[PDB]
Design a protein around this ligand. Structure first.
Ligand SMILES: Fc1ccc(-c2ncn(CC3CC3)c2-c2ccncc2)cc1
Length: 351
C-alpha cells in the first residue's frame, strides 16, 4: 500500500525507514553498505537493515545491486540468508535512489564459535551438516557462493547456521594479498585462476572449515598466493596429467610443472584422533581435481551425518533465472529493474 517512513540521522548517514522498524542502532558500516540493528514491530524479530550506499553510481554497482536483490529475493531455506523485506523512501522511479534490505539479525559468526578451541565431533557434524544442506539448496539453483568462510556463516546460541555474504556481488581485489583469512578458504583453481571454476569450489571451502572446527587451527594459512598453494599441494599432492590437461594458462601448467611432485598425505596422520568418518569425508572434499570433488548432495548422504541426514528434509531451490548476467543494460535500465524488484517484493509469511 505504502507505509509511513520516518527520517533520522545516524552516524552522519540519513536513514529514512518505515515506522515498523524501531530503535535503529548502528552495527557496522562497510564500503558495500551501512548496517543497523533494529526491532521490527511487525514480525517481532530483531533485524539487520542494510542501506546500500550508492547503488547506481555505475553500471557495475547498479548491476551488483540488482544482482544482490534478485539473489536475496530467491533464497528461501532455513540455512541460507533470507530477505524479510526491501524498501525505498522514493514514491516514484524518478526519485528512486536508495535501497534498504532487511533480514534476521544474526548475532555471532562461526569465528566466534571456534575461536576458543576445537569443538566436539558432534558439533562439527551438526554445523557442517547445515552448511551442506543450505549449499545443496544454493547449488540446486545453479548458484556458486564463491566466498564461504567462518565469517560468512552466522551461528546462533543453539548452533543453528545460515549461509550469507554470497560471493556473487563483490570483486575480491587487493584483499586476497598476503597472510589474509579471506584467501585461506579458496580452492586453488580459483585462487590462481587455473581454469573456469564450478560449484565444487564451495565444497573445497567447506572442507577447509570442517578441518578447522576439528583441529581448531586454520588448514592452509598461506602468507601469500604461492605459499598457500604450496601448503595445499603438500597435503593433497601435486597435480597429475589428468588435472594438468584441464588448466588453461600455459603459464600455470608451466609453473605447476616446475614443482617437485608430491604424493597425497595420510589425512589420518594429519587429523590425529578425529572420527574416521570425518577424515574420510575430508579426503572426499579436499580433492585437487574439482571434477572429482564430492557434491553437497552426495556429502549429505555420507555416513558422517547419519544422525542428521534426511533426504526428505533437505530441499532444493526453485529454478533461478540468471540470464540477466549476459544482459547489457545502462545504469538506468538496471535501476528500473531493481525498482521493479523492490516494488514487487512479497514478504515471507509468518504465523
Ligand atoms: F538484508 C541484509 C542482507 C545482508 C546483511 C549483511 N551483510 C553483511 N553482514 C555481516 C556483518 C557486517 C555486518 C550482514 C548481516 C548483519 C547482521 N545480521 C545479519 C546479517 C544485512 C541485511
Amino acid at each position: 500500500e505504502r507505509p509511513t517512513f520516518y527520517r533520522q540521522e545516524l552516524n552522519k548517514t540519513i536513514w529514512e525507514v518505515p515506522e515498523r522498524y524501531q530503535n535503529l542502532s548502528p552495527v557496522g558500516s562497510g564500503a558495500y553498505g551501512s548496517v543497523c540493528a533494529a526491532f521490527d514491530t511487525k514480525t517481532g524479530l530483531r533485524v539487520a537493515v542494510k542501506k546500500l550506499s550508492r547503488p547506481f553510481q555505475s553500471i557495475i554497482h547498479a548491476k551488483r545491486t540488482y544482482r544482490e536483490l534478485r539473489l536475496l529475493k530467491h533464497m528461501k531455506h532455513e540455512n541460507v540468508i533470507g530477505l524479510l523485506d526491501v524498501f525505498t523512501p522514493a514514491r516514484s522511479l524518478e526519485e528512486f535512489n536508495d535501497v534498504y534490505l532487511v533480514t534476521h539479525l544474526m548475532g555471532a559468526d562461526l569465528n566466534n564459535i571456534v575461536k576458543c578451541q576445537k569443538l566436539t565431533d558432534d558439533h562439527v557434524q551438526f554445523l557442517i551438516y547445515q552448511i551442506l544442506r543450505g549449499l545443496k539448496y544454493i547449488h540446486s539453483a545453479d548458484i556458486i557462493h564463491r566466498d564461504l568462510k567462518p565469517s560468512n556463516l552466522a551461528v546462533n546460541e543453539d548452533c543453528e547456521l545460515k549461509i550469507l555474504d554470497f560471493g556473487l556481488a563483490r570483486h575480491t581485489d587487493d584483499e586476497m594479498t598476503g597472510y589474509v583469512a579471506t584467501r585461506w578458504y579458496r580452492a586453488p583453481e580459483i585462487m590462481l585462476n587455473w581454469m573456469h571454476y564450478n560449484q565444487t569450489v564451495d565444497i573445497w571451502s567447506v572442507g577447509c572449515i570442517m578441518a578447522e572446527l576439528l583441529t581448531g587451527r586454520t588448514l592452509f594459512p598461506g602468507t601469500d598466493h604461492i605459499d598457500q598453494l604450496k601448503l595445499i599441494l603438500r597435503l593433497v599432492g601435486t597435480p597429475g596429467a589428468e588435472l594438468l590437461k584441464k588448466i588453461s594458462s600455459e603459464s600455470a601448467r608451466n609453473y605447476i610443472q616446475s614443482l617437485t611432485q608430491m604424493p597425497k598425505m595420510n589425512f589420518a596422520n594429519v587429523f590425529i584422533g578425529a572420527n574416521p568418518l570425518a577424515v574420510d569425508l575430508l579426503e572426499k572434499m579436499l580433492v585437487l581435481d574439482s571434477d572429482k570433488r564430492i557434491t553437497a548432495a552426495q556429502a549429505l548422504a555420507h555416513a558422517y551425518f547419519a544422525q542428521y541426514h534426511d533426504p526428505d528434509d533437505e530441499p532444493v531451490a526453485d529454478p533461478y533465472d540468471q540470464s540477466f548476467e549476459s544482459r547489457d543494460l545502462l545504469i538506468d535500465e538496471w535501476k528500473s529493474l531493481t525498482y521493479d524488484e523492490v516494488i514487487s517484493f512479497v514478504p515471507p509469511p509468518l504465523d
